[PDB]
A paper describes a structure:
Here we present a concise structural study on how the activity of SHP2 phosphatase is controlled by an asymmetric, dual phosphorylation of its substrates. The structure of SHP2 has been determined with three different substrate peptides, unveiling the versatile and highly dynamic nature of substrate recruitment.
From these highly similar tandem motifs, we selected the 2nd motif from human IRS1 surrounding Y632, to act as an in vitro model peptide of 15 amino acids (GRKGSGDYMPMSPKS). Our solved crystal structures clearly present SHP2 with an open WPD loop, despite the catalytic site being occupied by a phosphotyrosine peptide. This open conformation differs from most other tyrosine phosphatases (PTP1B, CD45, HePTP, etc., with rare exceptions), whose apo structures (i.e., without any ligand) present the open, and the peptide-loaded structures the closed conformation. Movement of the WPD loop is also necessary for the Asp amino acid to lock into catalytic position. In the latter state, an aromatic amino acid from the top of the WPD loop (corresponding to His426 in SHP2) moves to cover the pTyr with a π- π stacking interaction. While the phosphotyrosine was tightly locked to a single position in both the ppIRS1 and ppCD28 models, the phosphoserine remained flexible, and was to be located at a broad loop region defined by Arg362, Lys364 and Lys366 in the best models.
Residue numbers in the entry:
A (entry chain A): 4 to 282
B (entry chain B): 627 to 635
Amino acid sequence: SGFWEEFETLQQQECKLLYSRKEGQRQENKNKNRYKNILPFDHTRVVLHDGDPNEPVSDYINANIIMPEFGSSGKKSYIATQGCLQNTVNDFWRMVFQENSRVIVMTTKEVERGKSKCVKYWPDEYALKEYGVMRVRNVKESAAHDYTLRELKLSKVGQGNTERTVWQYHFRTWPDHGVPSDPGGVLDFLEEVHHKQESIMDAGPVVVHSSAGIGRTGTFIVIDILIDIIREKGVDCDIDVPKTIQMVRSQRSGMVQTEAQYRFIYMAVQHYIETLQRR
Amino acid sequence: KGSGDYMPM
């Protein structure tokens, strides 16, 4: 198998000492990680400023900035993160606000097979909620076949004219096991995400999450990166899936977790190329 | 199962 050996080669390259993950290992941060073994690299982690001065450690969230290229702007970058825990919802909105993120991609349900993959961090439709110092209104939900779009308005309580719209694209039909058997739904979803992000002047990085912030998160991010290369350079451009996975894995460990996800990435690229040909 | 580790599995 060309895929198996490509994916195994990549998996071998992570069977070694990787960059430091010390902040995530601090005792004060242990309950901020869904999984003890999945921690952000220190050098690309999102550092949360402006925290409660009573909290001894208030600068940590299990999240990393992911740039597709070395000199990427914030608007062309991503934040890869885990689904919120009950005790990290407020930190998640601190992150979205601080980094000026305007689009969130959620790749799980809240619960799958009886396990929490993300605690609900948005209000019910039309409702207003306070999450720490942040205020969020769910303005409107729009349901599609594979996803729901929620138009959220985020502001900082006690600072006026900080409001901005945050568009949550919630993919809801990813299977409990494996990957979708074809990429059409994911490609249609990423096309809407991309057009929304592109339309917002000076948007910050797109936030992408899954239960650990690496498997489905890495699969969505690498597909999005590759189809943007095709968008820009056209369907005969060089595409290097292993090198792109290596680029994102230098910024958060373990991105793209399974051989089925690896094959799905190739499938999505091929279908996108085909689409650019029929229409 | 039960280790507390993420297994996408």
